[PDB]
């Protein structure tokens, strides 16, 4: 029953400071038990390991009494001697590299060995995906003595992986994708990746190449070349258009607080237009890079142009979870802008917030919220190439309503011309979205899979509109003011969602509590994915 005093007993070398306090447990009361004697041992032999000595015999052997019931423990330690680190190797490593091993040693040569550091360096080593095995080794350098060298062996392994995706949702249709990857390309602790994939709206295929350092410090290289083909012809976010864009850029990533991050990038990018089946707007935009139309065609010669961009972003996120985070927040700041060589001349910049409130110890009572802004304009007496304009709807802005149903609509030529006004969502510079919802827990679902499913009821709410819209306002009074950030539409609805072991489906039905004459609704809504 219980016990007396500690004291800590033991050798040697001015151990028994930072060893003594405060694990030695004050007292209150004391307790004792039989597999609680275990760990409070490894607690100490730790704290001599940081310090030099690995080899550390602590024992615990304590004396009762039979009489006054209370047990005398005794720390017997023995705490060897101190093990000098000479340097540090690595074998088995055929394709890899000193470099790329040596990087995520924290332990440094010619210094006291430190059996955590030097412990927690096979773990970053595993968990890198680039070795099957790791292992380390003590040996001691004969003759020294107390000298040691620390090897790493590991077993190189298949870095190379091949992935497809398949999927189906209300807007988007048919998506697959496949990609082709080899990390750890070549040796050198990078990536290497070759995608390509399939909308309704593009296929784009992308060659990508990742330097996760680049600095010793965690800045992160990356490298794109891609080339996307685009055609919208299938709609409603008509005002259709082909694109056809091929580019390439250099993207400098910045890792700071964990749930900070911040990015630059450069880029080159070269866009080519065809159809522009010629509208009121776009014109505008034609003109303004000087282009030639000639009626009586319909449609504009073909248009081009390259656009060397700057890019920075600012990356937030709390989150307390992968997916379905029930507290916590997440945000961003982004940011474009036309560099000097660029024709086109504009910039853009963005902001959206997610955030979780639980109110609940629980947790399956959550109000859920996002905001969105997206805001582009033009400068140089250019506009906004039109093709870079933006559209609300669908899920992700607008439930309820069909993707790029939300925005200024445009005005086709009929001879004289620019005076017939259509349904087509030609696009606005100015979107705000916001969206608000109570998820409660899924009924008959549970008790087990009840994560894995989210429902909840939701408002969300969406504006797109055109800045520029009052230099053409007089000229058409009929037509709505396109111009007017306060044409907001809103819908209310259910919303279930679900990760399968297939893959993630997610559903919406809403009905608008807001509309505008000739937006397109599309209520029940839906996406189907998979992995492999």
Same mark, same amino acid.
């Given at each position: 029953?219980?016990?007396?005093?500690?004291?800590?007993?033991?050798?040697?070398?001015?151990?028994?400071?930072?060893?003594?306090?405060?694990?030695?447990?004050?007292?209150?009361?004391?307790?004792?038990?039989?597999?609680?004697?275990?760990?409070?041992?490894?607690?100490?032999?730790?704290?001599?390991?940081?310090?030099?000595?690995?080899?550390?015999?602590?024992?615990?052997?304590?004396?009762?009494?039979?009489?006054?019931?209370?047990?005398?423990?005794?720390?017997?330690?023995?705490?060897?001697?101190?093990?000098? @680190?000479?340097?540090?190797?690595?074998?088995?490593?055929?394709?890899?590299?000193?470099?790329?091993?040596?990087?995520?040693?924290?332990?440094?040569?010619?210094? =006291?060995?430190?059996?955590?550091?030097?412990?927690?360096?096979?773990?970053?080593?595993?968990?890198?995906?680039?070795?099957?095995?790791?292992?380390?080794?003590?040996?001691? @350098?004969?003759?020294?003595?107390?000298?040691?060298?620390?090897?790493?062996?590991?077993?190189?392994?298949?870095?190379?992986?091949?992935?497809?995706? @398949?999927?189906?949702?209300?807007?988007?249709?048919?998506?697959?994708?496949?990609?082709?990857?080899?990390?750890?390309?070549?040796?050198?602790?990078?990536?290497?990746?070759?995608?390509?994939?399939?909308?309704?709206?593009?296929?784009?295929?992308?060659?990508?190449?990742?330097?996760?350092?680049?600095?010793?410090?965690?800045?992160?290289?990356?490298?794109?070349?891609?080339?996307?083909?685009?055609?919208?012809?299938?709609?409603?976010?008509?005002?259709?258009?082909?694109?056809?864009?091929?580019?390439?850029?250099?993207?400098?990533?910045?890792?700071?607080?964990?749930?900070?991050?911040?990015?630059?990038?450069?880029?080159?990018?070269?866009?080519?237009?065809?159809?522009?089946?010629?509208?009121?707007?776009?014109?505008?935009?034609?003109?303004?890079?000087?282009?030639?139309?000639?009626?009586?065609?319909?449609?504009?010669?073909?248009?081009?142009?390259?656009?060397?961009?700057?890019?920075?972003?600012?990356?937030?996120?709390?989150?307390?979870?992968?997916?379905?985070?029930?507290?916590?927040?997440?945000?961003?700041?982004?940011?474009?802008?036309?560099?000097?060589?660029?024709?086109?001349?504009?910039?853009?910049?963005?902001?959206?917030?997610?955030?979780?409130?639980?109110?609940?110890?629980?947790?399956?009572?959550?109000?859920?919220?996002?905001?969105?802004?997206?805001?582009?304009?033009?400068?140089?007496?250019?506009?906004?190439?039109?093709?870079?304009?933006?559209?609300?709807?669908?899920?992700?802005?607008?439930?309820?309503?069909?993707?790029?149903?939300?925005?200024?609509?445009?005005?086709?030529?009929?001879?004289?011309?620019?005076?017939?006004?259509?349904?087509?969502?030609?696009?606005?510079?100015?979107?705000?979205?916001?969206?608000?919802?109570?998820?409660?827990?899924?009924?008959?679902?549970?008790?087990?899979?009840?994560?894995?499913?989210?429902?909840?009821?939701?408002?969300?709410?969406?504006?797109? =509109?055109?800045?520029? =819209?009052?230099?053409?306002?007089?000229?058409?009074?009929?037509?709505?003011?396109?111009?007017?950030?306060?044409?907001?539409?809103?819908?209310?609805?259910?919303?279930?969602? =679900?990760?399968?072991?297939?893959?993630?489906?997610?559903?919406?039905?809403?009905?608008?509590?807001?509309?505008?004459?000739?937006?397109?609704?599309?209520?029940?809504?839906?996406?189907?994915?998979?992995?492999?």
């Amino acid at each position: 029953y219980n016990i007396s005093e500690m004291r800590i007993i033991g050798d040697t070398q001015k151990l028994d400071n930072e060893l003594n306090q405060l694990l030695t447990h004050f007292k209150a009361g004391q307790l004792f038990r039989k597999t609680e004697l275990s760990i409070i041992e490894e607690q100490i032999k730790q704290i001599l390991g940081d310090r030099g000595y690995g080899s550390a015999k602590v024992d615990l052997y304590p004396k009762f009494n039979e009489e006054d019931h209370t047990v005398q423990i005794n720390f017997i330690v023995d705490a060897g001697r101190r093990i000098y @680190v000479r340097k540090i190797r690595f074998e088995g490593n055929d394709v890899t590299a000193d470099s790329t091993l040596r990087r995520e040693m924290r332990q440094q040569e010619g210094a =006291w060995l430190s059996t955590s550091a030097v412990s927690l360096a096979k773990s970053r080593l595993e968990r890198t995906g680039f070795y099957e095995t790791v292992e380390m080794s003590m040996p001691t @350098v004969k003759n020294t003595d107390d000298q040691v060298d620390i090897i790493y062996k590991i077993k190189e392994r298949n870095t190379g992986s091949i992935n497809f995706g @398949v999927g189906y949702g209300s807007g988007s249709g048919l998506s697959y994708n496949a990609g082709i990857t080899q990390d750890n390309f070549l040796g050198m602790g990078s990536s290497l990746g070759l995608n390509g994939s399939r909308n309704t709206d593009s296929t784009n295929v992308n060659l990508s190449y990742t330097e996760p350092y680049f600095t010793k410090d965690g800045v992160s290289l990356g490298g794109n070349i891609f080339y996307e083909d685009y055609d919208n012809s299938a709609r409603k976010a008509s005002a259709a258009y082909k694109r056809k864009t091929y580019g390439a850029s250099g993207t400098l990533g910045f890792p700071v607080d964990e749930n900070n991050s911040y990015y630059l990038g450069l880029g080159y990018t070269h866009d080519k237009l065809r159809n522009v089946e010629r509208e009121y707007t776009r014109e505008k935009y034609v003109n303004s890079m000087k282009f030639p139309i000639n009626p009586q065609n319909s449609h504009y010669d073909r248009i081009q142009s390259a656009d060397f961009d700057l890019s920075f972003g600012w990356n937030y996120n709390n989150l307390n979870r992968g997916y379905f985070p029930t507290a916590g927040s997440s945000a961003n700041i982004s940011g474009k802008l036309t560099l000097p060589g660029s024709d086109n001349k504009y910039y853009q910049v963005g902001t959206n917030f997610s955030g979780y409130i639980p109110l609940n110890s629980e947790h399956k009572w959550v109000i859920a919220t996002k905001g969105g802004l997206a805001y582009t304009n033009s400068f140089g007496g250019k506009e906004v190439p039109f093709y870079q304009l933006y559209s609300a709807g669908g899920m992700g802005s607008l439930r309820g309503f069909a993707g790029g149903s939300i925005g200024p609509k445009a005005i086709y030529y009929r001879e004289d011309g620019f005076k017939a006004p259509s349904q087509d969502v030609i696009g606005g510079n100015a979107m705000v979205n916001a969206s608000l919802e109570l998820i409660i827990p899924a009924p008959f679902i549970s008790d087990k899979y009840q994560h894995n499913v989210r429902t909840s009821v939701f408002v969300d709410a969406a504006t797109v =509109w055109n800045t520029k =819209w009052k230099q053409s306002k007089a000229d058409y009074p009929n037509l709505p003011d396109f111009g007017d950030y306060k044409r907001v539409r809103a819908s209310a609805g259910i919303a279930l969602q =679900w990760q399968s072991p297939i893959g993630p489906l997610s559903f919406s039905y809403a009905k608008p509590i807001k509309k505008y004459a000739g937006d397109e609704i599309e209520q029940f809504q839906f996406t189907v994915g998979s992995t492999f």
